[PDB]
Design a protein around this ligand. Structure first.
Ligand SMILES: Nc1nc2c(ncn2[C@@H]2O[C@H](COP(=O)(O)OP(=O)(O)OP(=O)(O)O)[C@@H](O)[C@H]2O)c(=O)[nH]1
Ligand SMILES: CN[C@@H]1CCc2c(ccc(O)c2O)[C@H]1O
Lengths: 329, 58, 287, 242
């Protein structure tokens, strides 16, 4: 079992053999987009406690949020008025999701249970159990099957109708914190606490690639709109852009004046701007193809823990521990 | 520990499976990303500020 | 002679300004940021508004009257000015008493603090205090129940050039009791209880972990009580003394002590707004 | 669309009223976190309290004050990533077995079991997200410790060499009939934690050591008193008076 080093050396040599040039070399004559200024358009209030997660609707109009008070609230961004308010059995929640068809909402947390809700009937539909650790994220692949990631270094692909696990993904060493689905819903990635990321296969159920560019825990992960790249954010104040086809990272986003962690990462519709939330009570707007800052979104009085961009790309919404949700443009 | 052998073999079979993948030069990948970004650069309100008439948040 | 009038204008100008600037800054800071919109800050807002009204209204006209040595407006304006003076002075102290009682509830009974104080109740308390203050200023001055009974008083009242404060014994005693002596014993007792609780807590800490490891409370209480007592004490004893026995206090001493009282509005932002959050707010804007 | 705007405004009012109703109940209650080493007796302490009067929850009140306690036993690992969620609790209850000063754990030689606790307490105290959270410490298993120390077979001095040069405090209040050896052992165990607590206190959060065993019905009062003291000290320090 001493050949493991040899395979790693071979992989490293193969990766080095295909590093023709740096992305900055090719993209150096491009005129930068310049400074970008965004102003608050809406401010949503009503959460007693401090928020973790949010998810925009597929119609770019409604959105959902979850807070430690034990309550999910479905807002309406256009008229800044609430629609639903669902009390929960367990007040420790760490994730939420919104259905692609706009019919279901899921939420799980410290208790090792993932619950889904039926909006158009608001009563609990099913409870999915079987994990041995706290959940960290969950996304609806479709209207009948959901993929979740838990704190016992595993991921699963549930079936709502029967409530039993169909496929179990194993191979990580540390806790899994975030995941993101491809536009075609045929592959997805996951960021663990062992400074690594993986590219799973939804159908076959086998890992294909492994990226280990980071050096600390990974807190957030996104996915490029083209479906051939993704970006991660760790606790070392760095965002790194990997590539699936080339099989190594291409660009790093870091600045000498920031030493705080990163809690969320998201792209834009065109993919030119990369948005990342920080522990510095604000947010930054990087440049994807040039690695240069282009703006700051200040206005939060505490830690920022949520971030998201609408499907049509008309606005970006943030949520912080100040129990306030803001809509920027 | 028999279990140790299992993990050691799995780390070998997985590494062997995760080693035989066709790879392309990073220049082609950078060019493709450049082409996509330049192609879809005129359809994102964040990058180019749209008129206030069509903005629903105004 | 010529120098004295020049000196007064400069000294008066510095006060009228400082008074308006402190209150304006406090109000702008509390209104701009939602982090400082604590329920206990509403009393500070009322106090700042009262100080702003006083500094904008009564100080400038008082300075003009004392410099010109002759009132240049009508009798109704004199009565309205006296009413505004009394209302602001008597509304700038009961707010301090309310703040002291709020601190008493916060420190003595920590478990029942949330229920006993609510944002809805604070508005009711503030409105009640302002109503009580307005009841003792406009009602007995617009109506002529406070007028004196000696020849100089009626001669000044008939004339339209002199605007001086002449009053009988009843109104003076009642207004002094309502404004000063009632909200003083309450504050003294409250702060004594608070100091006792602080000393007990520090003794407990020292007993618990003294081996591996007194004056802050004394300094804070000394500032809070001494500033107010020194600023507002002598006037509210000469007020009783001069009417109890006549031909004892010259009018110049009266005016000087009263004006010493007005400076107290120039220290409230420096006393009740020294929290680090207020410092951050002051550094964020106007800097 | 006049009804559509009007109807939405009807729903927002029904919720806002419900939120206003629930806010007072949320703000009235007090939350505590239960944490300790394994094989220490946290379950015994919690189960005993109610009869006296992946996650677990408990409801209890003293003098018409609502208290709530959450204990997490499903997520048992050296790395504690979920601890960031517990930065708004009133206090943290820490339970440690004071009699297990001579026992390796997990069939892993490891370290004497008390030291691992010490490491856990040090890590908890110096966490970045718990800079303003107090700790209530229960030194459990008082009778087994006394019996084991009375027995000459197992000696504290061997495992902890610093016990040799230790002298009892002059402010001690031993219980009636207590031998000097028991008092010395108890106070060494207490100030070993007190040193770690006071090293980097910074004056924002303190520690409340306590002694308890199986047959005890006063813990429910000690928790109440400690919570009241914690809130009082927080209020005193807030007004720049302590
Ligand atoms: N003599 C004595 N034994 C005690 C005491 N408290 C607990 N025990 C013993 O401890 C055991 C029960 O401990 P549990 O409460 O089940 O342990 P636990 O807190 O669940 O342990 P972990 O989950 O591993 O932390 C029994 O053997 C009890 O007799 C005590 O005060 N005195
Ligand atoms: C002339 N200035 C007035 C006169 C009497 C008076 C004042 C303040 C509060 C009172 O209760 C009073 O009766 C003074 O400010």
């Amino acid at each position: 079992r001493q050949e493991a080093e040899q395979l790693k050396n071979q992989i490293r040599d193969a990766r080095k053999a295909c590093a023709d040039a740096t992305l900055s070399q090719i993209t150096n004559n491009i005129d930068p987009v310049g400074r970008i200024q965004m102003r608050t358009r809406r401010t949503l209030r009503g959460h007693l406690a401090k928020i973790y997660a949010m998810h925009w609707g597929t119609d770019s109009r409604l959105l959902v949020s979850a807070s430690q008070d034990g309550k999910l609230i479905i807002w309406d961004s256009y008229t800044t008025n609430k629609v639903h308010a669902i009390p929960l059995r367990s007040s420790w929640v760490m994730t939420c999701a919104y259905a692609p068809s706009g019919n279901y909402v899921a939420c799980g947390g410290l208790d090792n249970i993932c619950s889904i809700y039926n909006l158009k009937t608001v009563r609990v539909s099913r409870e999915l159990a079987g994990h041995t650790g706290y959940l960290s994220c969950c996304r609806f692949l479709d209207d009948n099957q959901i993929v979740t990631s838990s704190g016992d270094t595993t991921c699963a692909l549930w079936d709502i109708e029967t409530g039993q696990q169909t496929t179990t993904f194993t191979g990580h060493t540390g806790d899994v914190m975030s995941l993101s689905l491809a536009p075609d819903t045929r592959l997805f990635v996951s960021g663990a606490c062992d400074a690594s990321a993986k590219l799973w296969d939804v159908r076959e159920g086998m890992c294909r690639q492994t990226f280990t560019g980071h050096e600390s825990d990974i807190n957030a992960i996104c996915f490029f709109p083209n479906g051939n790249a993704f970006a991660t954010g760790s606790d070392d104040a760095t965002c790194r852009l990997f590539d699936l086809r080339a099989d190594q990272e291409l660009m790093t986003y870091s600045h000498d004046n920031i030493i705080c962690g990163i809690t969320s990462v998201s792209f834009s519709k065109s993919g030119r701007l990369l948005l990342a939330g920080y522990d510095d009570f604000n947010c930054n707007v990087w440049d994807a193809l040039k690695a240069d800052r282009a703006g700051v979104l200040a206005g939060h009085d505490n830690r920022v823990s949520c971030l998201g961009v609408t499907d049509d790309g008309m606005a970006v919404a943030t949520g912080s521990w100040d129990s306030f949700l803001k809509i920027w443009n | 520990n028999t279990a140790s052998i299992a993990q050691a073999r799995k780390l070998v079979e997985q590494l062997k499976m995760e080693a035989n993948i066709d790879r392309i030069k990073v220049s082609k990948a950078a060019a493709d990303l450049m082409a996509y970004c330049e192609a879809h650069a005129k359809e994102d309100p964040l990058l180019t500020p749209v008129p206030a008439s069509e903005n629903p948040f105004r | 002679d010529e120098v004295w009038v020049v000196g007064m204008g400069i000294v008066m100008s510095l006060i009228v300004l400082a008074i308006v600037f402190g209150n304006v800054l406090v109000i702008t800071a509390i209104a701009k940021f939602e982090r400082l919109q604590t329920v206990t800050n509403y009393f500070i807002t009322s106090l700042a508004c009262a100080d702003l009204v006083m500094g904008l209204a009564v100080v400038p006209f008082g300075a003009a009257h004392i410099l010109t040595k002759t009132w240049t407006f009508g009798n109704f304006w004199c009565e309205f000015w006296t009413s505004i003076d009394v209302l602001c002075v008597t509304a700038s102290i009961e707010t301090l008493c309310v703040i002291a009682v709020d601190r008493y509830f916060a420190i003595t009974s920590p478990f029942k603090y949330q229920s006993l104080l609510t944002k809805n109740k604070a508005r009711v308390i503030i409105l009640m205090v302002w109503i009580v203050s307005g009841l003792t200023s406009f009602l007995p001055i617009q109506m002529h129940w406070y007028r004196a009974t000696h020849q100089e008083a009626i001669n000044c009242y008939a004339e339209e050039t002199c605007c001086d404060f002449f009053t009988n014994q009843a109104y003076a005693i009642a207004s002094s009791i309502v404004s000063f002596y009632v909200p003083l014993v309450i504050m003294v007792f409250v702060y004594s209880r608070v100091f006792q609780e602080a000393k007990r807590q520090l003794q407990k800490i020292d007993k618990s972990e003294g081996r591996f490891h007194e004056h802050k409370a004394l300094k804070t209480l000394g500032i809070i009580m001494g500033t107010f007592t020194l600023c507002w004490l002598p006037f509210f004893i000469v007020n009783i003394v001069h009417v109890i026995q006549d031909n004892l206090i010259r009018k110049e001493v009266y005016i000087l002590l009263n004006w010493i009282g007005y400076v107290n509005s120039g220290f409230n932002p420096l006393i009740y707004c020294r929290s680090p959050d207020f410092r951050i707010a002051f550094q964020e804007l106007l800097c | 669309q006049r009804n559509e705007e009007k109807a939405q405004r009807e729903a927002n009012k029904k919720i806002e009223k419900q939120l206003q109703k629930d806010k007072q109940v949320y703000r009235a209650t007090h939350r505590l976190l239960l944490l300790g080493a394994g094989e220490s007796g946290k379950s015994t302490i919690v189960k005993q309290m109610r009869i006296l009067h992946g996650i677990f929850e408990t409801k209890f009140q003293v003098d018409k004050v609502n208290f709530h306690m959450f204990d997490v036993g499903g997520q048992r690992d050296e790395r504690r990533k979920w601890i960031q969620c517990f930065n708004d609790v009133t206090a943290i209850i820490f339970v440690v077995a004071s009699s297990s000063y001579n026992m390796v754990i997990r069939e892993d030689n490891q370290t004497n079991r008390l030291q691992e606790a010490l490491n856990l307490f040090k890590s908890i105290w110096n966490n970045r997200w718990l800079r303003t959270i107090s700790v209530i410490l229960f030194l459990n298993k008082q009778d087994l410790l006394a019996e084991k120390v009375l027995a000459g077979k197992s000696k504290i001095e061997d495992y902890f060499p610093e016990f040799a040069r230790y002298t009892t405090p002059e402010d001690a209040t031993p219980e009636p009939g207590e031998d000097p050896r028991v008092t010395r052992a108890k106070y060494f165990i207490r100030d070993e934690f007190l040193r770690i607590s006071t090293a980097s206190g910074d004056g924002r959060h303190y520690c409340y050591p306590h002694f308890t065993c199986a047959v005890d019905t006063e813990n429910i009062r000690r928790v109440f008193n400690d919570c009241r003291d914690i809130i009082q000290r927080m209020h005193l320090r807030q007004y720049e008076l302590l």
